Design a protein around this nucleic acid. Structure first.
Length: 113
RNA sequence: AUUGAAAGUUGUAGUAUGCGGUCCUUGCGGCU
């Protein structure tokens, strides 16, 4: 499918390669927010919604796997972050507890995008 | 041929000491 990236000249070709899995990217929010694909869905109509972006991939499952594959590459750095976060908690003698999502969770659904 | 002649309001001196832009606030509702 035809995809266009309205960013600076040299970034546009790299963003193309990232979304096409021709080049590895290690930051999820970066590729999502600053390298938004504008997908030529039909005619001269370009779209930047997740519904249109999904067409860059074989299927919904392929799209999901890509996102999480990018996400997971921060694991090593995130572990140190989470450990310092726990150290932060205990320095303030915090009441620490863990809970699990019982259903789907979406915080910040309405952030302008 | 005068109450006249002569005489630097100058010298020294930190607008400074104390003081959290903070507190209260579910990016959500379902509409156009």
């Amino acid at each position: 499918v035809v995809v266009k990236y309205p960013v600076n000249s040299e970034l546009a070709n790299y963003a193309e390669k990232f979304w096409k899995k021709e080049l590895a990217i290690y930051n999820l929010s970066l590729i999502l927010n600053k390298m938004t694909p504008f997908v030529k869905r039909r005619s001269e109509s370009y779209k930047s919604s997740l519904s249109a972006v999904k067409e860059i991939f074989k299927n919904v499952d392929d799209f999901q796997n890509f996102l999480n594959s990018v996400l997971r590459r921060s694991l090593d750095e995130y572990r140190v972050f989470f450990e310092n976060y726990e150290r932060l908690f205990n320095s303030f003698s915090s009441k620490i507890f863990s809970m699990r999502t019982k259903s789907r969770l979406v915080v910040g659904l309405g952030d302008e995008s």
